[PDB]
Design an enzyme around this catalytic site. Sequence first.
Site, PDB file in Angstrom:
ATOM      1  N   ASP A 229       0.809  -1.071   0.030  1.00 44.80           N
ATOM      2  CA  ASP A 229      -0.008  -0.168   0.057  1.00 44.80           C
ATOM      3  C   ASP A 229       0.839   1.284  -0.108  1.00 44.80           C
ATOM      4  O   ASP A 229       1.160   1.750   0.871  1.00 44.80           O
ATOM      5  CB  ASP A 229      -1.011   0.062   1.265  1.00 44.80           C
ATOM      6  N   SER A 230       1.388   1.844  -1.180  1.00 44.49           N
ATOM      7  CA  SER A 230       1.714   3.137  -1.376  1.00 44.49           C
ATOM      8  C   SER A 230       1.009   4.348  -0.733  1.00 44.49           C
ATOM      9  O   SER A 230       1.756   5.304  -0.583  1.00 44.49           O
ATOM     10  CB  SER A 230       2.208   3.467  -2.970  1.00 44.49           C
TER      11      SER A 230
END
Lengths: 377, 377
Positions: free
Chosen positions: B263-264
Amino acid sequence: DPKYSTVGFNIENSYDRLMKTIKEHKLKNYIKESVKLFNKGLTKKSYLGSEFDNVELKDLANVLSFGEAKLGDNGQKFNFLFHTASSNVWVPSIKCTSESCESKNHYDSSKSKTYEKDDTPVKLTSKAGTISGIFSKDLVTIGKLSVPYKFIEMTEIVGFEPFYSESDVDGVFGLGWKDLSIGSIDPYIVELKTQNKIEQAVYSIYLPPENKNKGYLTIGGIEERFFDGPLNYEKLNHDLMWQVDLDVHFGNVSSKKANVILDSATSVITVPTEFFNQFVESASVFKVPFLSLYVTTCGNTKLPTLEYRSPNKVYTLEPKQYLEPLENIFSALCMLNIVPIDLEKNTFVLGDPFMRKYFTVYDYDNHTVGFALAKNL
Amino acid sequence: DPKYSTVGFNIENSYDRLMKTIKEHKLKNYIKESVKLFNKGLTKKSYLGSEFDNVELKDLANVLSFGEAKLGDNGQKFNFLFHTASSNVWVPSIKCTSESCESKNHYDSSKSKTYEKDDTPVKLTSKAGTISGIFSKDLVTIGKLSVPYKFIEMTEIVGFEPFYSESDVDGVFGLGWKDLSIGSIDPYIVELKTQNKIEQAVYSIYLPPENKNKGYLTIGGIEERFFDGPLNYEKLNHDLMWQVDLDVHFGNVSSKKANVILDSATSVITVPTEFFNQFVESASVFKVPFLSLYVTTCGNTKLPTLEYRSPNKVYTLEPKQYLEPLENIFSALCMLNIVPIDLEKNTFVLGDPFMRKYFTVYDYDNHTVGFALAKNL
């Protein structure tokens, strides 16, 4: 002036020491910015709550010193520190082989007309250090009073460093009950009265409110000019200690039938750890992280009057007697002169703060201790 | 330039937020003087060890936003934030009664040639807040790509404040797998490919190393120019999550068969609490009291290379990818972009720090995720 015999003594206090450390370690701004954080108050975390045993009872000792006591015919000069629980006086021998001893004043039996041999050997074995030596008898003077007293002349001194080396103190003079010897060697103050040099085996401590580096010892009577109002006596709860039975209340925090010891050499009021946490929790008092330091606004409206109740008298301490200003760190900031520490069960001590308010009397004859409201002189 | 369709987006990061707070609460000097204390090191106390659950997973969310997406024939403009776990796109209705909605851009079905009714109702009920609304179908464009997609038009928005009000964000665009509807509404990126607007249901995130406020989304193919070396694919361990099976080692601290989520939008690398304590204990890392902040010398020789091992590839992170300089607080000081937090059992997330090193690929067709060494552009 006084009609009874009186000596001044100097005190190095907890505040002086704390100031030293803050300069050593450059801590002012850390304390300043911590307090600001607290005031903001971004320190919801309590606990705080930091179990710092940095506290042993010796960490809290002030050094009460004087250099106008003399031994023997020739009047050999010595800087003693007073100890309130010991009966004996202690002084480095000229024979002292240890290095500690090299820079200190020495007792030389040979150089004294008045000297009598005793030669009975003594060893004091302790946590911080060990002392070997021997009893000798000579003229012990202070400085209006004089008597042949049996004292200890120390030959091996190991430990007690770095204090002993850095201190200008030579030995220890005993204002207490415990005699190391088994020859029932009385207190120096008992012996004065036995030999009729005074009229009563009594002394007082007077700690002036406005000079926290000074104290006054008076021997052989009650100096009426140090105090206002009546003297109250409490009876000792112990044959060999300046110790007394009292109920203690700090706000709603209380403890009945507590053992409270009078020691003006201790730098603070002490309190068992449980008791302290009950006290400080939501009293608006801030434990500065990583320091044995509790801190608050000097005008804090939540702080109670501390109470020490006897069946016929209560001794009290307002927040202004138990808080020390830190104006040179942060404006209107004070520290607590109360430390948590568990000794015997239910045991508390009254140190410097209590005696700045109460003039105190220490009565060997009648096995009592006396309290009265100190003047400001 | 690219041959596949590419959009920039802005990021508000953890560092930007932390800087904000330090200015709000005037914290620079407290941090400075704490660190000095540590360096001295008068903070023997660890523990430190402060169980700050200040951390929930949402405290660590960065906001990745863009304003070049358009709805319907008329091209109604909206600022979305990307969410990597949700399949659906979300946008305030013109019908929205709530106050949150007043300052925002609105979808007006009436004003759009292309609009189709669906009217199927939807409620999303959550911890932070609640959203009611209805599916509508219209032309969803970005900005080279376009397709009739079914999205949600929100009518009641309650909660999510104060972020939603203070944010210029309107709604949420979904780069994920979870569809709220039960009509099996595919991802926006699936639907593009179903309708042949792209050639593969894939996208990449490229987070440039030197601009931490920027990111780039590429849709429909692999843009060869963002990375050096080969692309490695790992297979998802979950039908509906960008989640992968790996062994994780941070020095001698390790955990096999860990669930690691890409999850950037998360601002940090996360790690279970136990794991973090094992890691940080005697690694020369300082937890600043009363702050969710871990701090160290930027040149610290004790910090290991972090490892995420698969059966055929290992992804690593050196200390320079997991430490953020704080040069404007204290010289050569850095913070840890690693936070302790327990989610499911044995679950870790790779946020912004990991993706600044690795260019990443998110592949709906093949149920894989792709890793490669980001260029610096």
